[PDB]
From Swiss-Prot, chain A:
Post-translational modification: Phosphorylated by NEK6. Polyufmylated by the UFM1-conjugating system composed of the enzymes UBA5, UFC1 and UFL1. Deufmylated by the protease UFSP2. Ufmylation of TRIP4 is promoted by ligand-bound nuclear receptors that compete with UFSP2 for interaction with TRIP4. Nuclear receptors-induced ufmylation promotes the recruitment of additional transcriptional coactivators like EP300 and NCOA1 and therefore the assembly of a coactivator complex facilitating nuclear receptor-mediated transcription.
The ASCH domain, residue ranges: 5-99
Disease as annotated in the protein's UniProt record: Spinal muscular atrophy with congenital bone fractures 1: An autosomal recessive neuromuscular disorder characterized by prenatal-onset spinal muscular atrophy, multiple congenital contractures consistent with arthrogryposis multiplex congenita, respiratory distress, and congenital bone fractures.
Gene that this polypeptide is encoded by: TRIP4
Residues of the full protein shown: 433 to 574 of 581
Name the UniProt record assigns to this protein: Activating signal cointegrator 1
Function: Transcription coactivator which associates with nuclear receptors, transcriptional coactivators including EP300, CREBBP and NCOA1, and basal transcription factors like TBP and TFIIA to facilitate nuclear receptors-mediated transcription. May thereby play an important role in establishing distinct coactivator complexes under different cellular conditions. Plays a role in thyroid hormone receptor and estrogen receptor transactivation. Also involved in androgen receptor transactivation. Plays a pivotal role in the transactivation of NF-kappa-B, SRF and AP1.
Length: 142, 138
DNA sequence: CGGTAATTCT
DNA sequence: AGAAATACCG
């Protein structure tokens, strides 16, 4: 079926944009391939948005094109989770982006996709299974 | 459509009508149809047996219990007719007053049970179902 | 962030 | 079952 990871905004929208290229967690995951991204229920403050955008200007340049909305509580899109590296192997295998994450495990993401219509959703911990009908309509929407 | 997640084996007993109230620590304004989902917590066979004995005391020896108590799924619905404090519970329902000592007691009527139990992930308190999940529930 | 019969897994 | 988690709501 469809497997999903819930992420706090404004990080989540950066992930489905391809602006944020890794996701850092304290725990390891065997999951590979298509990983759906849902924003958690957390509402980001305007400060949180501007501070995160500033940090990514340091990391990816002044001409990063950020999203104009960071909606919470919805399915945003998907990435492909190609690898889950320890922090040590992250630095060694990705020294050009090693600075994007200080977490114990680092989810290596490619092929970011962003949905045009974001389906409302209530998330779960870690990587969890989408209800089959939201998943179906979600891959249709793409 | 609104849902309440309940631990097995209490959850299936609610949709059976065997369990007639749900006691919680908190008040809810919700009235009318309330869907009951089993939480993901699995009861031991021992716990199921002890609970069934308890409900044989309260409802008779020939209570027809469900044959399984599946976890993590939509089970059915009740009508939530009232949410009483423990006092108003003792006053208005003194014949089942012993069935719950909780700060608030949800009075449940018209229990209905689905034939196929749809798997579902719950949320705390009374939470809103997806309208299409709500559709298929009938 | 605390309250919650949320869900996950050794 | 009891830990654990970017669960959810207020």
């Amino acid at each position: 079926g469809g497997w999903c990871l819930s992420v706090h905004q404004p990080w989540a929208s950066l992930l489905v944009r391809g602006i944020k290229r890794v996701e850092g967690r304290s725990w390891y995951t065997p999951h590979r391939g298509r990983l759906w991204i849902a924003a958690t229920a957390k509402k980001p403050s305007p400060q949180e948005v501007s501070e995160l955008q500033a940090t990514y200007r340091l990391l990816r340049g002044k001409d990063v094109e950020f999203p104009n909305d960071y909606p919470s509580g919805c399915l945003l899109g998907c990435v492909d989770l190609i690898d889950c590296l320890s922090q040590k192997q992250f630095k060694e295998q990705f020294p050009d982006i090693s600075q994007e994450s200080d977490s114990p495990f680092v989810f290596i993401c490619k092929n970011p996709q962003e949905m045009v219509v974001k389906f409302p959703i209530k998330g779960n911990p870690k990587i969890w299974k989408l209800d089959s009908k939201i998943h179906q309509g979600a891959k249709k929407g793409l």
